[PDB]
Design an enzyme around this catalytic site. Structure first.
Site, PDB file in Angstrom:
ATOM      1  N   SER A   7       0.858  -1.199   0.000  1.00 20.75           N
ATOM      2  CA  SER A   7       0.000   0.000   0.000  1.00 20.75           C
ATOM      3  C   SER A   7       0.909   1.270   0.000  1.00 20.75           C
ATOM      4  O   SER A   7       1.774   1.382  -0.857  1.00 20.75           O
ATOM      5  CB  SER A   7      -1.023  -0.082   1.160  1.00 20.75           C
ATOM      6  N   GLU A  22      -9.622  -4.648  -3.163  1.00 18.34           N
ATOM      7  CA  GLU A  22      -8.902  -3.524  -2.597  1.00 18.34           C
ATOM      8  C   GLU A  22      -9.818  -2.443  -1.977  1.00 18.34           C
ATOM      9  O   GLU A  22      -9.451  -1.823  -0.987  1.00 18.34           O
ATOM     10  CB  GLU A  22      -7.947  -2.893  -3.627  1.00 18.34           C
ATOM     11  N   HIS A  53      -7.907  -5.614   1.213  1.00 20.20           N
ATOM     12  CA  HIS A  53      -6.716  -4.804   1.209  1.00 20.20           C
ATOM     13  C   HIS A  53      -5.906  -5.149   2.439  1.00 20.20           C
ATOM     14  O   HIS A  53      -6.399  -5.012   3.554  1.00 20.20           O
ATOM     15  CB  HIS A  53      -7.140  -3.356   1.272  1.00 20.20           C
TER      16      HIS A  53
END
Ligand SMILES: *[C@@H]1O[C@H](CO)[C@@H](O[C@@H]2O[C@H](CO)[C@@H](O)[C@H](O)[C@H]2NC(C)=O)[C@H](O)[C@H]1NC(C)=O
Ligand SMILES: *[C@@H]1O[C@H](CO)[C@@H](O)[C@H](O)[C@H]1NC(C)=O
Ligand SMILES: *[C@@H]1O[C@H](CO)[C@@H](O)[C@H](O)[C@H]1NC(C)=O
Ligand SMILES: *[C@@H]1O[C@H](CO)[C@@H](O)[C@H](O)[C@H]1NC(C)=O
Ligand SMILES: *[C@@H]1O[C@H](CO)[C@@H](O)[C@H](O)[C@H]1NC(C)=O
Ligand SMILES: [Cl-]
Ligand SMILES: [Cl-]
Lengths: 532, 532
Positions: A197, A324, A437
């Protein structure tokens, strides 16, 4: 002594730690910078001054000052991401896991945590480097870096708060690895930087910045890329947000000096309390203090750099998770709740789109809506929920990463792309959130090998395979064992664009990851918004 | 005598014609207007002056002056649409087929031919009304109307060439039916107007124009609607094209009078030779001389009329064919040929889009391209060919018709929608063209009941079913036999939006005909082009 190491900065004493019936050495909380405190708040980091005597490296360091998620108190799904150590501005430390017996010149992997540049900790249970170091015989480093305004307040022109200092922290840690890892038995010429990320964006930022390129060999990016719409701002926007922070804290706004001075007098938590007020739009997946396109760390725009090949040319391994966007909808979009199936009404879909593409005019919003709406079935609550999930993940993670992979691969020396679509059987988050995510991390760090955590056999097997892919990639620039009967993860090429699924089933190769949606996000929508 | 009829305009003598082992009466080439010749060229039609004696109505009349398709000489697929009678400006005639014995007050169906307003003939083999009149016991009328500049040259403000006179021809014929059909045994209070393509647009134009509404009871529209992008122009565009025609013929362009006078001196064929030169763009599915939004025939824009309910409220039956666009790509798009499979390259697709949406800026063209391109497989020649086919049919026929059905149904008194997707087994056109524009007509006119034409049994059955749907609709405003075991063609409603397939398989009901594509064409693309 195995637990004693003499580095260029001084001696450090580690600790022997148990791991899956064996043991390895851990050197936790080694300082790589002067504490960025007081008049140093917002400044470039300084190298740590060498110390006499022996540094006790038996215990995890403080975490950097950050927003703390209290959105579900006592829920492990969210709390496992929060600081698990005392927060302090004195937080510039790294942790090293070293196989036992100490190796001589082994592959090094350096983890950079995500957290949207506003949070993150190197000390999280899910970032514990022992399983990876032990299983794959790598020296595993996790660094740390300032987040929030502390790492990213940007008043370009000022030398007291230039922006990007969180990235410079990361670079200082990579510098210290380069300079000292040899004493821990790591090969400083075979360092892989990897991150998820914001940490993945970070990895790609070091690939781009001339000042970082020489400090590592290769790179792994999980669910993030340097060109993500949330990962950087213009120098004007950074300035505007810095002043707004000042406005929130009743600061003298007459000069950079007056502003910075005022912000330097405030307690960490005062900054954190108003941090979210500076965002220009009602938005999800936007963070207040982020890297700034400054002309120093990044010499020109990220796009001209990617187009001209102005970046480190090496091998990369990268990819994304299936779902995500779900975390960000759970937290800010109307109609989403943790304990319901979150079926989304037409009205809530429309609101979601607005939150998801905050920079969009109405025509823009209509383009997104049309692209993700099944008009035979526009009131299907599951389709609206999943459509929004795709909107957020496509716009913020997958399509920017796909733009990066496609630009990178033209100049780079080898690309491996994955699509992680296995939902952990023990996830505490609801089913609607899918393959969330950040939920490949536990597999990369080998947590499914710990029986007491209750993964399946197949999950342990998947984890061992991913650890071995990551570590062989770091070792050789190729995730595949040469001369091995296993199904092979093909190179991603400009022409064929191949990737693999990462999950518990037998490996499948596909081409052109989410191409339909990414042509929309990377080509069509930008041209729409520019023309209107 | 059965073949002698005394109308208000004079007596007419018909002829007994064989049809499927029986016979009926035909009254061919009855005049309904003064010949629009000489100083009357471009003028409103005048009622035919009554004649003494008996009008010989044993033979088909002249066809109107028109462009003749020579694109494939001797090919029956194209030649079956060309005038099969001598062309003449003296062409304002109608044909009536009357069951034997003469009925007393039977359902009347009036056919309006298509041909893009630049061509068409009432006398075509495929428009022969005997099968329908005989099978379904209807009085079948085909009218005729001026096409090309002769019917549609428009210099608004001028009374010598006001525009729309071709529509007024159609109206004069409907007037004459209303006034005289009773003598042929038709009920002037139960007249259905029906037409294909330009004839379908025409039908919807009579539904809209206050001056036509009272002359018929209900309406059938095949593959055309009044709002089609090719079916009308502004009064400025009509003027511009009229002047350009004048420029092509070396006319004095100083005044409407000078221009019209010059155009009136020219032979028909001189007008026809330069007719295609006046189109503003490089285009397909655009015709030079078409109806003009004048404020007289159409009091306000077609869209405000549809929105306000400013139109005849009655029952309608309408629909489309699967592959409306193929004819127009065959004839003008690069890469399409009659004797090849026409697999379309990426470059030719791109060129096709430009021809298909001539009024589009680049952003517009990109929107269309994206909407119809499979980006997993963008070099698939069949997909590019079929995508273009869909582009042309969606933009020009299906989505405008769907906008019309949706606006109409809010105020109307009953809507039936079909999707005709059966390819005639004896088609001489290549397979790639699919279910071609205009190839439901032969089924509506009952040609598959003629053994010597070589349709299948199932095709005869389909034809009988469609004839019976059309005729029962005309009779009752409902294509369904009340009290009958047959599968029922449901009403199209604002809410449920149901339609049927028309083909040789058992009836299937679907909802929201091409909704995905039509939201694009009717909502999104227009908003895009307006904003940019
Ligand atoms: C077509 O029009 C007729 C009336 O002109 C409608 O029939 C009426 O329906 C209402 C409500 O059901 C009743 O109050 C009347 O008794 C009906 N009138 C007659 C003469 O039957 C009919 O609903 C319309 N059909 C459609 C499909 O719109
Ligand atoms: C280092 O720190 C730990 C925990 O505070 C302590 O138990 C240990 O004795 C310290 N000193 C050493 C290892 O010399
Ligand atoms: C694992 O399984 C045990 C026994 O069934 C259960 O009590 C425990 O909550 C689980 N442990 C976790 C989630 O750490
Ligand atoms: C009507 O026209 C046809 C063909 O020209 C002719 O054979 C016929 O005798 C004409 N006159 C009549 C029926 O009185
Ligand atoms: C119908 O079939 C016959 C005999 O097989 C054939 O010769 C003829 O061409 C066809 N007739 C048409 C197409 O009119
Ligand atoms: Cl353990
Ligand atoms: Cl016959």
């Amino acid at each position: 002594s195995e637990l004693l190491v003499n580095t260029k900065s001084g001696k450090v004493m580690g600790t022997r730690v148990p791991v899956l019936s064996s043991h390895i050495s851990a050197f936790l909380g080694i300082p790589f910078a002067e504490p960025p405190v007081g008049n140093m708040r917002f400044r470039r980091p300084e190298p740590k001054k060498p110390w006499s005597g022996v540094w006790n490296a038996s215990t995890y360091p403080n975490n950097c000052q950050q927003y703390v998620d209290e959105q579900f108190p006592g829920f492990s799904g969210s709390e496992m991401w929060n600081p698990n150590r005392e927060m302090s501005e004195d937080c510039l430390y790294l942790n090293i896991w070293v196989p036992s017996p100490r190796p001589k010149s082994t592959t090094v992997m350096v983890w950079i945590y995500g957290g949207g540049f506003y949070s993150g900790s190197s000390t999280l249970d899910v970032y514990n480097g022992k399983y990876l170091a032990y299983t794959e015989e790598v020296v595993l480093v996790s660094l740390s870096y300032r987040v929030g305004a502390f790492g990213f307040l940007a008043l370009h022109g000022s030398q007291e708060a230039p922006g990007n200092v969180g990235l410079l922290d990361q670079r200082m840690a990579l510098q210290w690895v380069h300079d000292n890892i040899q004493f821990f038995g790591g090969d400083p010429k075979t360092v892989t930087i990897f991150g998820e990320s914001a940490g993945g964006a970070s990895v790609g930022m070091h690939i781009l910045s001339p000042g970082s390129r020489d400090l590592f060999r290769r790179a792994i990016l999980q669910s993030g890329s340097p060109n993500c719409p949330w990962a950087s701002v213009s120098v004007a926007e950074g300035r505007r947000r810095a002043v707004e922070l000042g406005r929130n804290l009743n600061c003298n706004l007459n000069s950079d000096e007056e502003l910075i001075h005022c912000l330097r007098e405030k307690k960490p938590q005062e900054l954190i309390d108003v941090e979210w007020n500076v965002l220009p739009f009602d938005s999800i997946f936007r963070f207040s203090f982020v890297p700034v396109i400054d002309g120093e760390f990044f010499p020109t725009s990220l796009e001209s750099m990617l187009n001209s090949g102005n970046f480190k040319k090496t091998q990369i391994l990268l990819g994304v998770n299936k779902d995500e966007g779900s975390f960000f909808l759970l937290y800010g979009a109307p109609g989403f709740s943790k304990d319901s199936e979150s079926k989304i009404s037409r009205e809530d879909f429309m609101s979601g789109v607005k939150l998801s593409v905050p920079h969009a005019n109405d025509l823009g919003l209509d383009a997104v809506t049309l692209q993700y709406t099944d008009w035979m079935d526009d009131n299907n609550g599951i389709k609206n929920r999943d459509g929004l999930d795709d909107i957020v993940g496509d716009h913020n993670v997958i399509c920017p990463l796909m733009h990066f992979v496609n630009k990178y691969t033209k100049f780079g020396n080898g690309t491996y792309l994955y699509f992680f679509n296995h939902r952990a059987s023990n996830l505490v988050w609801p089913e609607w959130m899918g393959v969330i995510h950040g939920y490949e991390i536990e597999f990369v760090f080998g947590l499914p090998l710990v029986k007491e955590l209750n993964y399946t056999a197949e999950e342990e097997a998947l984890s061992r395979r991913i650890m071995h892919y990551w570590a062989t990639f770091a070792k050789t620039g190729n995730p595949n064992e040469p001369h091995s009967q296993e199904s092979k993860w093909p190179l991603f090429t400009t022409k064929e664009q191949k990737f693999i699924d990462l999950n518990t089933e037998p490996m499948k190769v596909h081409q052109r990851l989410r191409v339909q949606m990414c042509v929309f996000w990377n080509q069509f929508l930008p041209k729409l918004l520019n023309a209107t």
